[PDB]
Structures are given as structure tokens and as C-alpha cells.
Design a binder for this molecule. Structure first.
Ligand SMILES: CN(c1c(N)n(Cc2ccccc2)c(=O)[nH]c1=O)S(=O)(=O)c1ccccc1
Ligand SMILES: CN(c1c(N)n(Cc2ccccc2)c(=O)[nH]c1=O)S(=O)(=O)c1ccccc1
Ligand SMILES: [Cl-]
Ligand SMILES: [Cl-]
Lengths: 292, 292
């Protein structure tokens, strides 16, 4: 079975003053808190048992929003990150949560969208050995881990934030790991910046021949929310799809309902308190519409 | 083989004064003229032989932009629509262009986007009998043809712009027809509004048991450009994907290049005149990037 982890840590001061109010991942993308999207993403890969790592100060705030997840058929747990020592520390912090299980790590500020996303996540979640990551063509690969391919399409190198990228293929912030991830991670020492890097972990799988790098196609939307401009862009986007469709993106209640993790009576009950606004009215409509 | 048709007709005065300047389908969605999207859509379904129907006044303008299509591996032809007698008149006007072949009709102001769009269009283009259309969940099904399904998911009725819709499933403006389409069409008389309706044609296939209605999923983007607000929304959208990816949506040159309809020397030649701007630089980069 596969446990999940959301890294919803500090972005420091780089989005202040917006974020003096609350954590980045509490800020909304259009109509719902940023963290609903990566949560919804782990739910879509069929993952029910999730660890949220954030700062000591923001843990309670996430707790208040999300609880223990039992309202939605989930078991949500929390772990505090004291210092921003890199995202590969997620595995050490999360070491007893993980235990002997498989895992998935997602960034709390990435936004995914597209057709058959459920199936793309299934095929990486389905593999019970090695590691699986997604490469997505971007304008600015310097901002991310960057995968290099040989003429045959096989991954041959990874580099973290290179000043001179080998490709425009960025590694997305959504990752799948077998039971080897903790131990590889424990053998890491901090990078020149002073962080435990996810790229160093993925590289170790690569050298073992156990890294699968699947392409996320250009028909998928991968966005993030690292600047005020891009956050804004992300809101417009979702808003446009939602107002077009009469359907929501990353509605956790709906997803749990479609995963069969809660039933129509439980859904109606979550809808009860929110009946006056468009969101509770949306969850009520899902009881009596067939949506393909 | 399958011929294509683009209906890029009058929107009257309903977008004036923007459109006193030029036809709607000449207006740009972000960086390229509206008509590049439905053109690109027919190209993606593997269609090379295309009839553009527009007003007498706009035919030359389309001609000037697009030519005979031979620059892009296409054979583009033109036919004038004198009066706005409905979109089912496309088949009568287009009757000798169609001849004994299969066909596809697309609206000149619809925007499609998503993963495996190429494969969704292939599976309807592949069928050599009957008709195939796509139903897409929308907020406002009153604006469109609306398909009804039975508990099993089978189409059981179609209605044009109903005041009291049976579902939120709109029939998109992208349609595939066998050789029966002209004759069915010739048996149509104008609706109460005074138009030859596409819904009446699709209904006739439905009653013959020869209408396939495939769902276009919520992971696809279906947008249109009927109002100034929505046009604007469509531009933002495309712009967001393009600036994110460093990739274009509905670049006809690129598509013809990937269809193998033109070669790397022809592409370089189309790039030559546009070298100074971002678009010609984009076509040059496609000569030497591998894009999955
Ligand atoms: C639009 N997407 C989506 C989908 N596709 N669905 C339908 C669904 C729900 C569960 C498993 C497969 C499909 C849904 O109920 N809510 C959604 O937001 S999605 O696959 O692109 C998605 C799913 C979760 C988070 C972000 C996007
Ligand atoms: C993003 N899309 C797209 C794609 N997918 N491609 C790649 C491609 C090109 C030809 C056949 C299959 C895939 C492309 O070269 N240009 C594109 O705009 S698309 O399928 O959503 C599309 C294609 C044509 C018009 C509008 C969207
Ligand atoms: Cl794709
Ligand atoms: Cl879908």
C-alpha cells in the first residue's frame, strides 16, 4: 500500500506581505485553499493515508481546515518542520509515518489538470518497485530539476536548478517511491545551499536503473503558485474551467465521493453546512447528476 | 477519405464595434487568429483538404491569411455564404466539395485543448459509417444543442437551445459525417428562426441508430469566443499555457510538421520571414528540439 506526503512548508518571506496573514498553502487558488489541489491529487492516485508537514505555526491552521480527514474517507496526520532544511527531509521527518510502505510526495503549491490524470497517476502508483516521476515541457527549466534524455527517449541525467539546462523537461513536484526511499535519503548530506535535495534521491534511483520518468503531456496543465503573478494566473485558469463547465477542479469531497470512500449520505451531510453558498450547492447537485 | 469544413461565417453585429474592423474569426485569441484553432483541430484529426465558408466580404481576408494551404501541406478551398441561413447550409453550399467523401464540420470560433486530443479525434475520424459528436459538461446548456442520456449512458434525445435542458451535456461544434450527410441535409427545411439546424441532422443519424456520442472529458478545455468577455478569457487561457510551457497551442506549422505533411526544410522556410518575432523563433526551435 501507498502512503502520501504533502510538503506545505515555509516559503519564507518571498510572498510577504500576503503571507504574513497565513501560510502560502492556505491562500486560495480562486475558490479553494491552495492545499486542496495537491490533496486532491493524492486522492486521485487512490491515496487515503496522508502526512502533512508544515511549520510549527501553520500545523494548527492546516489542522483546523482539514482535521484528521475522516469526514472525507481519509486518515490525515501532521508533522512539524522546524527549519527549511530541504524537501528531502520530508522522508526523515516522515520516517515512522512511512514505515515499510510505499510512498508519494507532492508539493503543497503545485496545481495539476488534465484528461485521464487519474490514469497517469494510477500507472505510476501501480508500480510497487523503484521510483516514478513526471517531466513536463516548460519555458524556464532553470527553476526546477531538469531531466536529460538520450536519442531513444531514456533518462540519462538529472540536475537541480541548472544555470545551463540540458532540456526544457522539468521534473514536476509529484513523486512516487518504493521502500528504499528512506534509506537512500538517510545517506544524503546537505547541498551547497544547505538543503537535502529531492534530485539527489531521484538520481540514486536513476543509477540503480530503478527510476521511471514518464512524460506529462502538453495537454496537461502544470502550474505553480510561487509568485503573486503566477498565483493570480492560476486562479484565472481554474475559474475559467469551472465557470465554463459547471464542474469543479480539486473538490476533495467530490473526489472521495467518486473514489467510493464516502457515500451519498455522508456527502449530503458535508453539504448541509455549506448550503447557502455555491460550494455546498455544488456538492448537493453531485448527489443527483450523472457526470461522466 | 475525410474532407473538412470550417464555418467561419457572420456573427452579425453582436460583437461590433470590435468586428467592424474584421470578421470574428480573424480576431486573435492571444497571439494567433481565431481560425488557427479550428484549422489546427481539423489538422490534428488528420484532415488535409478543407473548405472555408465565410461571407463574400471576408473570403478574401481569409484567403490572404491562409492561401490555398499548400505552404502547410494542406489543400484549402473557399466558398462564400451570402446569407446566414443556418450552419446546416454548410453541406449544401459545400455539396460538390464533399462529393462522395466523408466529412467533418467545425465552428470557426471554438477552442479545444487537452491531453490525447489527437486520439479522441482519431477514434471518431476512424469510423467510416454514421456520425460522431462530442458532449461536454457545461454551466449553460441552453446555449447549445443538448444531448440526453438514459441510465445506461446511451443518447436518447437531442434538443437545440432548449429553455429547459435535459442535461448539462452540450454537443460541441465539432462533427463527423459519412456520405449520408448531404442527403439528410437536403431534406431539411428552415427552423422557426429560419435556419437549417445541425441538431436536425444529428437527430436523423440518432433515429437511424447511426449517431455515436462520445464524451469529451472535463480534463479537456472547450471554450468559445462568442462574447468579448469569453474571447478575453480564451486569450488569458492560451497565454497561460504557452508562457508556462514554452510550447504553442494550435500552431498549424508545427502540427503539419508533426503530421509529416511538411519536412524540416519547408518549416525552416516558413520560419525565415518571421525570424524577428517570437513565432518564427518558435518554428526554428522546433527544428532542433525533441518535444514528446
Ligand atoms: C478535473 N479533474 C477532476 C476529475 N477528473 N474528477 C473525476 C474523477 C474523480 C476521481 C477519479 C477519476 C476522475 C473529479 O472528480 N475532480 C477533478 O478535479 S483532474 O483529474 O484534472 C484533477 C483531479 C484532482 C486534482 C486536480 C485535478
Ligand atoms: C496542445 N495540443 C497540441 C498538440 N498536442 N501537439 C502535438 C501533436 C501534434 C500532432 C498530433 C499529435 C500531437 C501540437 O503539436 N500542437 C498542439 O496544439 S492539442 O492536442 O490540445 C491541440 C491541437 C490542435 C489544436 C488545438 C489543440
Ligand atoms: Cl498530451
Ligand atoms: Cl477527463
Amino acid at each position: 500500500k501507498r502512503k502520501g506526503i504533502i510538503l506545505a512548508g515555509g516559503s519564507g518571506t518571498r510572498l510577504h506581505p500576503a503571507t504574513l496573514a497565513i501560510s502560502k498553502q492556505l491562500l486560495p487558488v480562486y475558490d479553494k485553499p491552495m492545499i486542496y489541489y495537491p490533496l486532491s491529487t493524492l486522492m486521485l492516485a487512490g491515496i487515503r493515508e496522508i502526512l502533512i508537514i508544515s511549520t510549527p505555526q501553520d500545523t494548527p491552521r492546516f489542522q483546523q481546515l482539514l482535521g484528521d480527514g475522516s469526514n472525507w474517507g481519509l486518515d490525515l496526520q501532521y508533522a512539524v518542520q522546524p527549519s527549511p532544511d530541504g524537501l528531502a527531509q520530508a522522508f526523515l521527518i516522515g520516517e515512522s509515518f512511512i514505515g515499510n510502505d510505499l510512498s508519494a510526495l507532492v508539493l503543497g503549491d503545485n496545481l495539476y489538470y488534465g484528461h485521464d490524470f487519474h490514469e497517469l497517476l494510477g500507472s505510476a502508483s501501480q508500480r510497487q518497485t523503484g521510483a516514478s516521476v513526471f517531466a513536463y515541457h516548460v519555458l524556464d527549466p532553470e527553476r526546477y530539476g531538469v531531466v536529460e534524455f538520450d536519442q531513444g527517449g531514456k533518462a540519462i541525467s538529472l540536475e537541480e536548478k541548472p544555470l545551463e539546462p540540458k532540456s526544457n523537461y522539468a521534473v514536476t513536484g509529484l513523486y512516487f517511491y518504493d521502500q528504499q526511499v528512506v534509506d537512500i535519503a538517510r545517506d544524503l548530506k546537505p547541498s551547497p545551499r544547505g538543503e537535502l535535495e529531492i534530485t539527489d534521491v531521484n538520481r540514486a534511483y536513476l543509477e540503480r536503473g530503478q527510476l521511471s520518468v514518464e512524460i506529462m503531456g502538453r495537454g496537461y496543465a502544470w502550474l505553480d503558485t510561487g509568485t503573486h503573478d503566477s498565483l493570480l494566473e492560476a486562479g484565472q485558469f481554474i475559474a475559467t474551467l469551472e465557470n465554463r463547465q459547471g464542474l469543479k477542479v480539486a473538490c476533495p469531497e467530490e473526489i472521495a465521493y467518486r473514489q467510493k470512500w464516502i457515500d451519498a449520505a455522508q456527502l449530503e451531510k458535508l453539504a448541509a453546512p455549506l448550503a447557502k453558498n455555491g460550494y455546498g450547492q455544488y456538492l448537493k447537485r453531485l448527489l443527483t447528476e450523472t457526470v461522466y
